Amino acid sequence: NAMKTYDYIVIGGGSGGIASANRAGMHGANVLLIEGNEIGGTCVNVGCVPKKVMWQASSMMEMMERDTAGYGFDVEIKNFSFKQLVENREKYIDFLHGAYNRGLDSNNIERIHGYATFTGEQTIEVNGTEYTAPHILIATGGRPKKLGIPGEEYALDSNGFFALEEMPKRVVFVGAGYIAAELAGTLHGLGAETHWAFRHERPLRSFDDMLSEKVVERYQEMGMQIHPNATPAKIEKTAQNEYVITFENGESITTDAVIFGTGRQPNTDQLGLENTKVALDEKGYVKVDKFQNTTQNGIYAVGDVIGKIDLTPVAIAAGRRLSERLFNGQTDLYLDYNLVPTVVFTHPPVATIGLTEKAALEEYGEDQVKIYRSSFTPMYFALGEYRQKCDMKLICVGKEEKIVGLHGIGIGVDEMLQGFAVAIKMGATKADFDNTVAIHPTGSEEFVTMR
Template identity: 55%
Template structure:
């Protein structure tokens, strides 16, 4: 059995895995990192980074629609090209990926972009190759859960939002946390008719009460449409395109 020897193996190329691999290598360890998808983890690929790009796009849209004329800008063509925003978002993320790769190169961190599985407590197998180390870090992160209701497979999670190729005409966002609120706000500002459904009397229950009250008031005036005390029981696929 061909086995490659390392001092430290890192499984998962998100924020934690990247930092740990680089730091260990900087201290002289022979390090290899395994990542099944794209380096950067949720934040860079399917979280805060692409979300902020979308948020900036939404902010531009709101500024043009709400304030441009008051400052003397008379814009006649406000056509929004979703594909352009998505392409620029990808280009921004690609630059971050390249930065991570340079960091790995500078620190001497080896990497393999594939799934790793344990053979024993100190050995993993990747695509038929075995790797061993006295220390192995599991930094694989987590994943979203679908609600246990009929038709849940027709919905999408936040990961799927970033895979959209076009702006939906209408969206129902279910959830009261900051991710749901952010995405509902972005979709609404970009032009989707958006409804936000929360199970209690308000979203963001763990946030400052005055801030949330201000947000709820703003939603009532400008959208998205907020539906309180709303718990989905079933999702049905309708014969129409949204």
């Protein structure tokens, strides 16, 4: 009957929760981890992992259809089974569940399958029983928002996309963020007649202009239909087993599926926070200080639920550093949220870190900003007729030309960024790049040979 006591209770078994629980357990803490759905959270089950698998498949189909002849190959794709692709993808995710469970076991983590709700400042309830600890981590992540139009029951969010076991012949993606950009490129590369509709002149408005421009340009060249200045009005199911999505501008598209990515919301509703001193912002995100402390001593928060940078490695690092602080005496340790690198898996991929050109100009002024810009055809395309471009930009500030932003779009940029992120975090200048000998022949060398 008495509350079962632990040193640490982690609510949510996703990127942030698993990382924080494991690190606390490694340091000898008696840890309880609570997950209501599936171990691994969003990234493993309906996020980064399945997205990357599908991207890889779509890239493979594109390479085979377009780039093989130039290298002397006459290739025929006798069949493509989207169903088998999905089955293999899900079999890998099941394997990941096992890998994560073995990691948790190695760190002596005890787990509960169910949803937790606070019942006091240091007490939660799940499946009828109460548990208490002096340290509780909220790592509940987020979930998709609804489309909010008539016929939305016919549309699919990202979860709906992953639930697909057959590919639609025609599809309309609604949204301007990286999720819509990535998923649109995936079904398009796999052969669906693909439309991408977004509200303004351009999508990916938070990205550097070079990147938003080029993602659209590259997709448009390969045959994706772009519908800018398109606000959804309604989705109608017709008598012929198909849908018609109409926009406020009057245009319409007949399609087999509508997939939307119009924002996510934090999993703080029905968490019982009224029983704590944890404050939420207007959007429902948990307020935290630099140390991941909520407004109540004894409760912490990391990951998507705090509404800062919604990436798996951020949640992981925030969670690990938090456990080092609480259970390994690293009293002053915290995660720096500046200069976090991001890769977006468009076709080709995008790499970005630091400030956009417009943000740099606003912060430092035109007289203090110098932009280096490069555009070249990767050697990979030298033998075919399709000359896809790779575009790169370095944003430098002051006499010293300190790099405050680096952006690129092109084949292979997904693997080029990590090292440059290290150098930029260290305060790299244009001179530091220039003094590093190039590696030839690679696309990466173009970053250190810009004039």
